[PDB]
Paper text:
Complex II is both a functional member of the oxidative phosphorylation pathway and the Krebs cycle, thus linking these two energy-harvesting processes. Members of the complex II superfamily are identified as succinate:quinone oxidoreductases (SQRs; or succinate dehydrogenases, SDHs) or quinol:fumarate oxidoreductases (QFRs; or fumarate reductases, FRDs) according to the preferred direction of reaction. No matter the direction, SQRs and QFRs share a common architecture with a large soluble domain and a smaller integral-membrane domain. They are comprised of a soluble flavin-containing subunit, an iron-sulfur cluster-containing subunit, either one or two transmembrane subunits and either zero, one, or two b-type heme groups. Diheme-containing SQRs generally perform menaquinone-linked succinate oxidation, a thermodynamically unfavorable reaction.
In the present study, we obtained a 2.8 Å cryo-electron microscopy (cryo-EM) structure of a trimeric form of an Sdh2 protein from [name], which will help us to understand the mechanism of this catalytic process in the diheme-containing SQRs. The dimensions of the Sdh2 trimer are 110 Å in width and 105 Å in height, adopting a mushroom-like shape. Within the trimer, each of the three assemblies contains four canonical proteins: an FAD (flavin adenine dinucleotide)-binding protein (SdhA), an iron-sulfur protein (SdhB), and two membrane-anchored proteins (SdhC and SdhD), each with three transmembrane helices. Here, we have identified a 3 kDa subunit [name], which has only one transmembrane helix for its secondary structure, which is located near the transmembrane helix I of SdhC. However, the equivalent QP-binding pocket in [name] Sdh2 structure is completely blocked by the [name] subunit, making this site totally inaccessible from the outside. Two b-type hemes, denoted as bP heme and bD heme based on their proximity to the hydrophilic subunits, are located in the membrane-spanning regions of the subunits SdhC and SdhD, and their axial ligands are His D107–His C87 and His D65–His C47, respectively. Fifteen phospholipid molecules and six menaquinone/menaquinols are all clearly observed in the structure, which is in agreement with MS. In the present structure, cardiolipin (CL), phosphatidylethanolamine (PE), phosphatidylinositol (PI), and phosphatidic acid (PA) molecules are mainly distributed in the cleft in the transmembrane space formed by neighboring subunits, playing roles in mediating the interaction of subunits within protomers of the assembly and interactions between neighboring protomers of the assembly. The bound MK/MKH2 interacts with the side chains of Gln-D94, Ile-D95, Met-D98, Trp-D102, and Leu-D103 of transmembrane helix V in one protomer, and the Val-D142, Ser-D145, Tyr-D146, Val-D149, and Thr-D150 of transmembrane helix VI in an adjacent protomer of the assembly.
Author numbering:
A (entry chain C): 15 to 136
B (entry chain D): 11 to 156
C (entry chain B): 23 to 260
D (entry chain A): 2 to 305, 347 to 581
E (entry chain K): 132 to 260
F (entry chain H): 37 to 156
Write the structure that this text describes.
């Protein structure tokens, strides 16, 4: 038998869930990036083809999502590294989490603004 | 009548006496491998901050983002030792980082030891394939391919 | 008297194995805890309801259970400042056993996995062999080193909130590492090396994904993950 | 019905039980039965220190400790036992520290000590700073240390085994204890542990009072077992009522007013303990403080943080010798039956318990009972076994399960506890004690028809709650008949009818024997002389 | 001289290692956990297998088919508390990894034990654990 | 505890996995070399140069070299361990094997990585 339970614990728990999910997202994307870039050793035209198909609005929204994934993973990983190395880390967890929420907000809205301008001017 | 005894055999390949209640818990792997995989994730994360975020910035936000990218752009960037070494370090650090992370993920989501073995083998295969393909493309690239 | 509703996850191990929630209506004075309402249920309405409890208020750790999502140790749920005291309206409290340990009956789990993991980190003093007959000397600042992990009442509110403990494999858990820190950081001990070698495996201290569920669940306030960090640092700077 | 064969069987895994197990583990083949897990025991609720004459921060010899114990007991302790307790108390504390216990350290770093309660310099001069401690949590550390040692030496624990009876096989030279009939909570099975020696470390019984500080699991079962087998119970009318008791519910506040200048104010902004006891403002003996509080709240000068006395400790119990052997007369001894802790009455505390002497008691006499039972088991041999000893227990469980009466166990128990805390509490009278006797007889005839609503077998807590109510009723009647017999005012037992100590007629332990077998029976009272060596009574 | 054979035998610790306080009434085991280490309880210790192993004729000190059979018997026994220590004995350079999957042992056993399948099960217990 | 722990388990597994890969690598190599157009009778520098102008065949040959050499070196490690009687002989034979294997891997990798079609 199996029951469905939401445990409703610390916010560090949801940070860890998001860290795991975004990391696996980057892993699978990187498999694909490395293949389609390996396509640069066959011809210029094949590479140009596949990347011209990577310049659509759907894939633009996907690239925004990938920016979000990489950004959150990097910031929360800085938090995790500080917790593990800095001897006052575990105290100031949950203040690092607010700091990186704010940082993610500003960097992400700036990046999405720039990328949205690029996608508009086309 | 009594209560039937509980079966201790998880799967065929698993000695039940391995999860005996009173059995001594002793390390089940290469000694000091976990310490160094842990330390590697920390250090390679510190390096990957710069490598991965600088890559993303220069690609998406610098001049015209993806709408400038093509073969000639790649060929101009890879004519520089700076960008060649940057992309090689990015490939190697990122693949080893991600592969060790997915090692952890498999290890704690796979229920059977056979599933764990074969998923770790698939992971090692895919990581090796991506590393050798990326390394080949970086090392043996020539702008005059046609 | 406010007439709270309790929604308890029932489970009869023998007669039916087909049972889920049950709702009971129980009066609630403001100077109540959740154990008082569980007692009202067991004494008056039901009586198949089986939970653990010993102490009056000298904490022993018997009644860890999952209340409204979190591991809460029923005798301390305080039942006083009800926010629906602001809008007069129905209240509900959801109660169920702690997670990760096998359920034996509704709210009674099997604590033998927990204690077998505890007494695998050699949780006892090991010394040389010439007892000084005169109260082994230890500084008032060597005393305050392993302090704050001497408050563990072994209730499993931490271990049964670790996602890594819910996961596969065999993680030691936060409580075993707390009770191993207690001895590793003891001056008058002669086995720190073997304890740190016990905690240095795949299923040891490197499986902590630095969630602070344990620190948030402990009813004594032990900083369980700071203890885990100090063990990790003692292991990597060696 | 399962069968086990062990040399030594300890019933209880608290302080005294796990101490006796630490000792008798290496020697013999020992088992420990617990209705809880070892670390869930009342001992862990202890916060005050553990007193011993170590003289690390000051100077004291054990003789001042012995005098203070003897005078605190209100001249009903046994001086031989008090002597033994103190001059072994030094080494008891030292061996706890050498087993791993984290005491608080002194600027040098040996063991820090602090002042406590009614400990005197020498024969009533000044504080002496005896009490060792670990933190605000001393009993918890003692319990953890004893459990870690039992884990080190690999003791066998039978957790959640409600030991319900013992088997006394009658040899021609008297009775002898052979086995313990227990009830496994987890499966519903009856087990018979046949042993050579049996140690009873089942802790006290304070749950026959509505307002009490004891656990929910301290009903008193070693006392009830030993009392049902026909053996006597000694000095059961001496209950200690702690003064500071969370006037609402009953929790203890032993920390604040003892440590700092917490003044006990009554109603008006007025102190009273300075007029009820000079020479010390409010650090007087607990019985005196509680009599004062009850008197003033009774005379109309009380309110209505608040406090009120709560039943805390039972100074009576199973009468033993300094080595732990359970008596069956004033002189004889049951072969192969030992007792230690709060169930045992060596009469160290006498008529009033001096703080921090209980952890001392359990350490010293649990070690003594452990080595004694180990020696006995390694010397003698298995005796016999009666015809199917579990017959009574299986019939008892079966017939209390199998029918549907019309009474509620919670109602009977609430009525008992309310009646006791009304009548047989801090102040007792003849009319109130007779009222409580009629109440207890009514509840004993009501208990004859109760309902266990579970009827299951796996984890049946309702069955065991009814079974424990049986013990509560027996012990309540023992307490009431003893307190109605003793027509004086000594220590914890105060009587408004005769408010002055009678050193000529009532300086003896009371011993009670049960006559019949069913609940409603007769209690025959005999007397036991109190030993005296040097200290003589004085007001 | 059978003493090399028996020395290799009593080096995999071929006895039941357990707690230290027996249960007085024959510790329990399922008829499912019992039928697992069957077929290796038939070894009469004749050495017809170990003395047909080319890896045993070779250099070094290979344990041998018979030691590995009598260790399989105890590794796959539920009521044992040294399965991991035995598996760590067989996980050395001269342990179970020196079997070159010759079936000489299986062909030679007079009880019909499937010696090399026992060796395979120990190998797979070391791979997947 | 005679050597590095868990080294034999992973050498065993490596022989199995490299065998699975080497089936395709080595047998495709032998097929395409000996029985495709004229077998050996077509092979020369121009054939090698137009084959190694392809990422497919370059990666094929480098994988073949590395897998085959590590496979063979581990197998010969086993053979030496089974035939050498003296510990000094075993030491010096394992050292000679390690030296020859390293030299062959270094030379083959150099040739593959550095090959240029236009040499004269
Ligand atoms: C497109 C871009 C995407 C990028 C792709 C990235 C590349 C992959 C990266 C890898 C990362 C891991 C991915 C998962 C992460 C964690 C998830 C997880 O743990 O879930 C486990 C979780 C555990 O469940 P369980 O209850 O413990 O097991 C139940 C069994 O399924 C019930 O079955 P069972 O209990 O009976 O046993 C399971 C089974 C094994 O279970 C498996 O399914 C594993 C299959 C792996 C394939 C083997 C390839 C090995 C290559 C070796 C080379 C070196 O055991 C066997 O029976 C043996 C069969 C395997 C034979 C292998 C050899 C055959 C070929 C060899 C020669 C080939 C000739 C050429 O559930 C799963 O099994 C999910 C399966 C995972 C599939 C993910 C697919 C991702 C890639 C697909 C690309 C499209
Ligand atoms: C051309 C294409 C072919 C491809 C070539 C492939 C190359 C790699 C081959 C890898 C595998 C090699 C062969 C594997 C088959 C295994 C069969 C086997 O083990 O049976 C051993 C078999 C029985 O062994 P045993 O009964 O225990 O010992 C009896 C001794 O023979 C009786 O001797 P002993 O009792 O008098 O004492 C043992 C003695 C003999 O020890 C040896 O056998 C060593 C032989 C190897 C030569 C040492 C080279 C060291 C290089 C170091 C670099 C790092 O050791 C010593 O006395 C110590 C002195 C040696 C010092 C050497 C270091 C000096 C140079 C270092 C500095 C250089 C300055 C610049 O007898 C053999 O030793 C046969 C030797 C096999 C010859 C190699 C065949 C292929 C290589 C030929 C290349 C042309
Ligand atoms: C709130 C509180 C605070 C206290 N503070 C102090 C203090 O500061 N200093 C001090 O000296 N004393 C103090 N005491 C009293 C002191 O702790 C007791 O004298 C002592 O703890 C008695 O413990 P014990 O070893 O006799 O058994 P306990 O620790 O009382 O427990 C009895 C054990 O026996 C087992 N058991 C009981 N009944 C049965 C049965 N029927 N079947 C099977 N097993 C059974 C149980 O498993 C249990 O663990 C305090 C008491 C209380 C209630
Ligand atoms: C309160 C403030 C919030 C604090 C913390 C916020 C953390 C949340 C950010 C994490 C987002 C994780 C998303 C990961 C999945 C994902 O979006 O990626 C997929 C894309 O899925 C989507 O479509 C996502 C759509 C874009 C929206 C994502 C942004 C959401 C963040 C909003 C934050 C609040 C404002 C896959 O894309 P790809 O890598 O395969 O692309 C290949 C390119 N060739
Ligand atoms: C942008 C890139 C940021 C990457 C930087 C992250 C690396 C930080 C961790 C490095 C390890 C060193 C360390 O942090 O430990 C020192 C502590 O360092 C600190 O004080 C850290 C406090 C501030 C954090 C600085 C990191 C800033 C990066 C975050 C901003 C990026 C956005 C030592 O302190 P101790 O407690 O161990 O002393 C005992 C030794 N005997
Ligand atoms: C540890 C694991 C290591 C793995 C190493 C094993 C490698 C064995 C040989 C594999 C060689 C792969 C290199 C590919 C070069 C090539 O084919 O490309 C070279 C080809 C020439 O091939 P031919 O001359 O043989 O016909 O050039 C082309 O014209 C091909 C046209 C389009 C092909 C697209 C391929 C680009 C990338 C896609 C790879 C497909 C993999 C999909 C995985 C999901
Ligand atoms: C929308 C986002 C991205 C785009 C448009 C993009 C584009 C590219 C480009 C243009 C190249 C090669 C050209 C050059 O190096 O100058 C490349 C290669 C590479 N990228 Fe990305 N990239 C993105 C995200 C990422 C991310 C998130 C990672 C790693 C986590 C990554 C890692 C790499 C690596 C390692 C290479 C080297 C490829 C090889 O060696 O064959 N890239 N990607
Ligand atoms: C960009 C900067 C990055 C930083 C600072 C970083 C940091 C970290 C850290 C510290 C961990 C360990 C987390 C833990 O053990 O709880 C981790 C895990 C992980 N990383 Fe990264 N990482 C980065 C980039 C990447 C990249 C580029 C990838 C993949 C290509 C990746 C994939 C993963 C995965 C899959 C995990 C496992 C998550 C888990 O196990 O919870 N990360 N990261
Ligand atoms: C009659 C049989 C064989 C012939 C005629 C032959 C011929 C060749 C040729 C023509 C090349 C280089 C040109 C190219 O790769 O396109 C070569 C290289 C290579 N061959 Fe063979 N081969 C034979 C058998 C084998 C076998 C049996 C193996 C391995 C088991 C093997 C492994 C290799 C390797 C690893 C290389 C790479 C050389 C290097 O990287 O320097 N060959 N062989
Ligand atoms: C360049 C090609 C190869 C070389 C140099 C080579 C060499 C060797 C050697 C010397 C051994 C040791 C034999 C022994 O210890 O008895 C061995 C074992 C082995 N070979 Fe290869 N071999 C090659 C190709 C292959 C191929 C194509 C397969 C296909 C499956 C394969 C599968 C195996 C296996 C499974 C073993 C282990 C045998 C055992 O452990 O009993 N090998 N190899
Ligand atoms: S640590 Fe805190 S939570 Fe975990 S067990 Fe000990 S007390 Fe309970
Ligand atoms: S042959 Fe069969 S029986 Fe004779 S030893 Fe080898 S295994 Fe045991
Ligand atoms: S709950 Fe679990 S993973 Fe880490 S910090 Fe606390 S242990
Ligand atoms: S005879 Fe020898 S090598 Fe392997 S399968 Fe049988 S053991
Ligand atoms: S009852 Fe002891 S802690 Fe809740």
């Amino acid at each position: 038998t199996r029951r469905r339970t939401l445990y409703r614990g610390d916010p560090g728990m949801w940070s860890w869930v998001l860290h795991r999910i975004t990391g696996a997202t980057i892993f699978f994307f990187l498999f694909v990036h490395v293949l389609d870039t390996a396509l640069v050793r066959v011809s210029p035209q094949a590479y140009n083809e596949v990347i011209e198909t990577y310049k659509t609005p759907i894939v633009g929204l996907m690239e925004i999502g990938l920016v979000a994934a990489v950004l959150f993973h990097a910031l929360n990983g800085i938090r995790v590294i500080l917790i593990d190395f800095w001897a006052k880390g575990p105290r100031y967890q949950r203040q690092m989490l607010a700091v990186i929420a704010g940082l993610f907000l500003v960097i992400f809205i700036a990046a999405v603004g720039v990328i949205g301008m690029h996608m508009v001017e086309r | 009548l009594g209560r039937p005894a509980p079966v201790m055999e998880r799967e065929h390949d698993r000695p039940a006496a391995l999860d005996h209640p009173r059995a001594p818990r002793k390390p089940r792997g290469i000694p000091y491998f976990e310490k160094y995989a842990w330390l590697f994730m920390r250090f390679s994360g510190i390096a990957l901050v710069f490598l991965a975020l600088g890559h993303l910035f220069i690609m998406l936000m610098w001049q015209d983002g993806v709408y400038r990218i093509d073969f000639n752009y790649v060929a101009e960037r890879w004519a520089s030792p700076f960008w060649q070494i940057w992309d090689m370090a990015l490939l190697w650090l990122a693949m080893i980082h991600g592969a060790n992370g997915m090692r952890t993920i498999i290890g704690d989501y796979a229920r059977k030891n056979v599933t764990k073995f074969w998923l770790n083998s698939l992971l090692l295969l895919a990581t090796g394939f991506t590393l050798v393909l990326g390394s080949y493309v970086l090392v043996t690239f020539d702008a005059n391919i046609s | 008297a406010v007439m709270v509703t309790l929604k308890i996850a029932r489970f009869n191990p023998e007669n039916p194995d087909a049972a889920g929630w049950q709702s009971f209506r129980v009066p609630c004075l403001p100077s109540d805890r959740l154990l008082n309402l569980l007692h009202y249920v067991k004494w008056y309405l039901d009586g198949t309801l089986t939970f653990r409890r010993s102490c009056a208020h000298g904490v022993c750790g018997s009644d860890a259970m999952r209340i409204n999502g979190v591991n809460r140790l029923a005798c301390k749920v305080l039942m006083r400042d009800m926010l629906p005291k602001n809008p007069n309206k129905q209240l509900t409290i959801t109660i169920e056993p702690i997670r990760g340990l096998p359920v034996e009956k509704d709210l009674v789990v099997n604590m033998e996995p927990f204690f077998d993991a505890y007494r695998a980190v050699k949780p006892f003093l090991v010394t040389s062999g010439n007892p000084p007959t005169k109260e082994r000397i230890q500084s008032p600042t060597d005393r305050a080193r392993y302090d704050d992990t001497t408050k563990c009442i072994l209730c499993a509110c931490c271990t049964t909130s670790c996602p890594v403990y819910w996961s596969e494999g065999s993680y030691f858990g936060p409580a075993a590492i707390v009770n191993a820190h207690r001895f590793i950081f003891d001056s008058r001990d002669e086995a720190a090396a073997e304890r740190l070698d016990i905690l240095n495996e795949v299923d040891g201290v490197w499986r902590c994904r630095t969630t602070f569920n344990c620190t948030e669940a402990c009813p004594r306030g032990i900083q369980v993950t700071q203890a885990i960090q100090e063990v990790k640092r003692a292991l990597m700077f060696a | 019905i399962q069968e086990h064969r062990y040399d030594v069987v300890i019933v209880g895994a608290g302080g005294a039980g796990m101490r006796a197990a630490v000792e008798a583990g290496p020697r013999a083949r020992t088992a420990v039965l617990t209705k809880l897990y070892p670390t869930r025991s009342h001992t862990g609720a202890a916060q005050g220190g553990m007193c011993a004459a170590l003289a690390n921060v000051e100077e004291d010899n054990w003789e001042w400790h012995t005098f203070d114990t003897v005078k605190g007991g209100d001249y009903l302790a046994d001086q031989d036992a008090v002597e033994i307790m103190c001059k072994e108390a030094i080494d008891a504390v030292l061996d706890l520290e050498k087993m791993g216990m984290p005491f608080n350290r002194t600027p040098e770093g040996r063991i820090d000590q602090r002042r406590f309660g009614g400990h005197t310099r020498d024969h009533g001069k000044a504080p002496v700073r005896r009490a060792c401690y670990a933190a605000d949590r001393t009993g918890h550390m003692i319990l953890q240390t004893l459990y870690q040692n039992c884990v080190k030496h690999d003791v066998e624990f039978f957790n959640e085994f409600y030991a319900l009876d013992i088997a006394l096989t009658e040899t021609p030279a008297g009775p002898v204890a052979t086995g313990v009939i227990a009830y496994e909570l987890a499966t519903g099975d009856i087990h018979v542990f046949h042993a050579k020696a049996i140690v009873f470390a089942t802790g006290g019984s304070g749950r026959m009072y509505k307002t009490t500080s004891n656990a929910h699991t301290l009903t008193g079962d070693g006392l009830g077992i030993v009392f049902r087998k026909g053996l006597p119970l000694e000095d059961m009318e001496f209950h200690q009522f702690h003064p500071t008791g969370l006037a609402g519910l009953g929790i203890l506040i032993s920390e604040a007013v003892r440590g700092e200048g917490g003044r006990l104010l009554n109603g008006e902004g007025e102190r009273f303990m300075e007029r009820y006891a000079p020479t010390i403002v409010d650090l007087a003996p607990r019985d005196i403080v509680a009599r004062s509080m009850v008197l003033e709240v009774l005379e109309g000068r009380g309110a209505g943080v608040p406090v009120y006395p709560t039943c805390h400790y039972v100074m009576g119990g199973i009468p033993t010798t300094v080595n732990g052997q359970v008596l069956r007369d004033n002189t004889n001894v049951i072969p192969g039956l030992y007792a230690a802790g709060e169930c045992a009455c060596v009469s160290v505390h006498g008529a009033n318990r001096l703080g921090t002497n209980s952890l001392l008691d359990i350490n010293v006499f649990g070690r003594r009972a452990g080595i004694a039972a180990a020696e006995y088991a390694q010397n003698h041999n298995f005796v016999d076994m009666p015809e199917n000893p579990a017959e009574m227990v299986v019939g008892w469980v079966g017939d209390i399960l199998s029918e549907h009466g019309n009474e509620r166990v919670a109602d009977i128990r609430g009525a008992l506890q309310q009646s006791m805390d009304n009548n047989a509490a801090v102040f007792r009278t003849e009319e109130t004690l007779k009222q409580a006797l009629t109440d207890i007889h009514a509840l004993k005839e009501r208990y004859s028809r109760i309902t266990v609503h579970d009827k299951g077998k796996r984890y049946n807590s309702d069955l065991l709650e009814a079974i424990e109510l049986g013990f509560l009723l027996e012990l309540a009647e023992v307490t009431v008949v003893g307190a109605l017999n003793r027509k004086e005012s000594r220590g914890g037992h105060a009587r408004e009818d005769y408010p002055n100590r009678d050193d000529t007629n009532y300086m003896r332990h009371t011993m009670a024997y049960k006559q019949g077998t069913d609940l409603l029976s007769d209690i025959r009272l005999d007397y036991k002389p109190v030993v005296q060596t040097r200290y003589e009574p004085m007001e």
